[PDB]
Amino acid sequence: APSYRVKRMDIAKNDEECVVNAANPRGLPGDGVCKAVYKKWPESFKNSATPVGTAKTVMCGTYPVIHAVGPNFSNYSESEGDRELAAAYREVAKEVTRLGVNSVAIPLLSTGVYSGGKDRLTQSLNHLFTAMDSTDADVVIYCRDKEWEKKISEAIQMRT
Amino acid sequence: APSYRVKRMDIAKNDEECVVNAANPRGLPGDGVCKAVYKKWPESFKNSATPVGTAKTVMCGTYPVIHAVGPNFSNYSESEGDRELAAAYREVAKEVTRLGVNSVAIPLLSTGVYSGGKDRLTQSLNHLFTAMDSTDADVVIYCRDKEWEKKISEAIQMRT
Amino acid sequence: PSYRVKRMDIAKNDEECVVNAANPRGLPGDGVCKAVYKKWPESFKNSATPVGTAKTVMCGTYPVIHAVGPNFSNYSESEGDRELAAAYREVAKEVTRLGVNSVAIPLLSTGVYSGGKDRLTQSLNHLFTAMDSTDADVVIYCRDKEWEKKISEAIQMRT
Amino acid sequence: APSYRVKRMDIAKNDEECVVNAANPRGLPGDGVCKAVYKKWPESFKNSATPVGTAKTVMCGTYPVIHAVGPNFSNYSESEGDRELAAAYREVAKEVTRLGVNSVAIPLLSTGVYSGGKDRLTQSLNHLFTAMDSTDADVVIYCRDKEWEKKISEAIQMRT
Ligand SMILES: CC(C)Cc1cc(C(=O)O)[nH]c(=O)n1
Ligand SMILES: CC(C)Cc1cc(C(=O)O)[nH]c(=O)n1
Ligand SMILES: CC(C)Cc1cc(C(=O)O)[nH]c(=O)n1
Ligand SMILES: CC(C)Cc1cc(C(=O)O)[nH]c(=O)n1
């Protein structure tokens, strides 16, 4: 019985079986979720580079870390960006399957420094749901804001 | 004359002035010891969320429940987890002291589903002693395994 | 009451009794408590006493006053200040009851019980306040050069 | 089956059951590996002084820090320094065995500011192998230079 969940804290401080990193295409430390991921899991960044709209697993010991590269909407148009964001989440779902875990911590890709100024909560979350709906894992979504916790909560409740 | 004792029984039926819950950061029911604590004192889980390495007290009536959150060693390194386990027990001693109680019931934190498949009896117990040695409360340690009871009892005996 | 300070091991004091910076469970512990345990081990027989209290146990005829200051890691600043005053108050009572002319005393709650905070002034002010009620010579023991200078100044500006 | 591995990262974020500090015989914080170690485990430097060619374990909570003092080759002759470097690793092996740990994080001793201006990758690594081959522990070697990572990896693989 796979479920969707949402919790307001640092995604590094998680009690799920794996984590998705909001990564850049060069696999460098960056900022945001990527900083906290580089702090708690620096070993995961070895050969973590992968193109925009793709994902890549690097295990640090026993806990898998999936580097998902959403588009930077400063470089991408809204049209082309939307395709790449869908593509990134598609590979996250695959990696949650193709590896084969039971739970996953996942941030909303392209909703911070890659957002290009715009609020992309609903956009990113809908691409998250679309891709992850074909997986067996318990999904848990992370963020630093309470408004965002409530709006993600209502999103989850009104589809169940 | 403050003492340490060990009892092999359900901590939900303790004979002490407060109880430590082996809690998760989400203040959810959980499983095992955390489930039995939720069954006996359900209303103590209102706003009981507190991060790893901390303890938060919530009253069930006037009976204090100290929600102590040890690290999950599946998701923490040996180094970082050891530091957070020490911090969790330190905050338990803080809360026992704040409440003014003469006795406290306590489980061994990070020793079950949070142990990362490692025997952490000695690790958890030494952090417990280290924290609680500066308090004047009677401490009763609760376990379920008969062998663990023996090894905990021996550890208590060779301090005096 | 007189007041002095010396930078040396309190286990080698030259006073008629000693105050142990004790823990509530009567355990040998570390720091000043360990040194006290090495020189006067038999004074730790039933030496456990609650926070903010003192209990005298004789080693031969030499009284060891086990005073338990609060660990400021466990106590709030409010409750810890009250318990620190209570510990020193219990010491002064025992010094009066024993009838000693002198006493060796450390600064309670200033080391591993400090909660990462400088409590020289706090502990010393509770010391003065409690130990002014006796007429015994008080000798304070530390191991830091800085502490010795600060403790000296606080004695002189109250003469 | 115990392995040797190499990771190019800060040893202070290791995922092993204990760490070897590249130390000085004074027991002082220093620079390089020693600084990072001092920042993560400062209480392990309490009475950590140990002579050149020896190692000394100081606990930080329950996490062992093994202070190992390789020779400064600026001060030593090539033959005497070689003897002291080998001895230091021998003492590391003893501590690892005595602690009963399943794994250890270790730097290459005498290869930076103690190198005397020479490349001692092969010299130091072979003394490490000689000592640690008699232990049951997984060994993870930590370095910072990309090249050194490759050469250490090659050296590991051509033994198996
Ligand atoms: C290191 C980071 C700048 C890379 C990043 C940031 C976001 C974001 O803005 O949430 N999303 C993403 O897919 N990648
Ligand atoms: C709901 C529980 C899974 C949370 C928990 C379990 C232990 C334990 O394994 O004993 N410790 C702890 O601090 N917290
Ligand atoms: C065995 C010790 C940890 C007990 C102790 C330490 C201090 C202190 O930190 O000076 N004060 C005190 O009253 N008791
Ligand atoms: C504080 C540090 C200067 C001490 C040090 C440095 C090296 C080294 O050069 O890698 N090796 C060693 O055994 N000890």
Cβ(D107)–Cβ(D143) under 8 Å?
A: yes
Structure tokens at D57: 């374990």
**Spatial separation of the C-alpha atoms in residues A27 and A45, rounded to whole Å:** 6
B83–D62: do the CB atoms touch at under 8 Å? no
Are chains C and A touching, using the cut-off of 8 Å on CB pairs and a minimum of 3 such pairs?
no
**Spatial separation of the C-alpha atoms in residues A133 and B98, rounded to whole Å:** 47
**Spatial separation of the C-alpha atoms in residues A7 and B56, rounded to whole Å:** 18
**Spatial separation of the C-alpha atoms in residues D82 and B150, rounded to whole Å:** 49
Strand ranges of the sheet holding B55-60, from the earlier edge strand across to the other edge: B4-8, B138-143, B103-107, B19-22, B63-68, B55-60
Which CA distances in Å does A145 have to A7, A10, A104?
A: 10, 11, 20
To the nearest whole angstrom, how far is the Cα of B48 from the nearest Cα of chain C? Answer: 20
Name the residue with tokens 């009871």.
Answer: B149
For B104, the 3-state DSSP assignment is: strand
Which chains sit next to A, with 3 or more Cβ pairs under 8 A? B, D
**Spatial separation of the C-alpha atoms in residues D83 and B132, rounded to whole Å:** 47
Cβ(D104)–Cβ(D138) under 8 Å?
A: yes
Q: CA angle D111-D77-D153, nearest 5°?
A: 25
**Spatial separation of the C-alpha atoms in residues A9 and B27, rounded to whole Å:** 13
Q: Which of B131, B92, B129, B160 lies closest to C112, judged by CA? A: B131
Method of elucidation = X-ray
**Spatial separation of the C-alpha atoms in residues B123 and B81, rounded to whole Å:** 11
Cβ(C105)–Cβ(C17) under 8 Å?
A: no
**Spatial separation of the C-alpha atoms in residues A69 and B67, rounded to whole Å:** 38
Give residue C134's Cα distance to chain centre.
Answer: 15
**Spatial separation of the C-alpha atoms in residues A148 and B1, rounded to whole Å:** 52
**Taking each helix axis from N to C terminus, what angle separates C120-131 and C77-98, rounded to the nearest 10 degrees?**
40
Residues of A in contact with B28 (CB under 8 A): none
For A56, the 3-state DSSP assignment is: strand
Which CA distances in Å does B90 have to B71, B127, C72?
A: 14, 8, 11
Cβ(B83)–Cβ(B130) under 8 Å?
A: no
Question: Which residues does residue B131 pair with via DSSP β-bridges, in sequence order?
Answer: none
State which amino acid sits at residue D119: D
To the nearest whole angstrom, how far is the Cα of B129 from the nearest Cα of chain A? Answer: 26
Strand ranges of the sheet holding D55-60, from the earlier edge strand across to the other edge: D4-8, D138-143, D103-107, D19-22, D63-68, D55-60
A vs B: CB pairs below 8 A: 17
Q: Is the CB of D125 under 6 A from ligand 4?
A: no
Ligand 3: nearest atom to the Cα of C30: 1
The DSSP annotation for C105-147 comes to: E--TTSSTTSSSS--HHHHHHHHHHHHTTS-SEEEEEES-HHH
**Spatial separation of the C-alpha atoms in residues A85 and A95, rounded to whole Å:** 16
Question: Which contacts of C30-39 are long-range, i.e. CB under 8 A and separated by 24 or more positions?
Answer: C30/C112, C31/C111, C31/C112, C32/C106, C32/C111, C32/C141, C35/C9, C35/C10, C35/C11, C36/C10, C36/C11, C36/C64, C38/C11, C39/C11, C39/C12
For D41, the 3-state DSSP assignment is: coil
How many A from CA of D16 to the centre of ligand 4? 20
A11: number of CA atoms within 13 Å, CB side? 29
Name the residue with tokens 């060619």.
Answer: D53
C74: number of CA atoms within 13 Å, CB side? 27
Q: Which of B20, B16, B15, B27 lies closest to B52, judged by CA? A: B27
Which CA distances in Å does A127 have to A10, A41, C44?
A: 22, 26, 68
Which chains sit next to C, with 3 or more Cβ pairs under 8 A? B
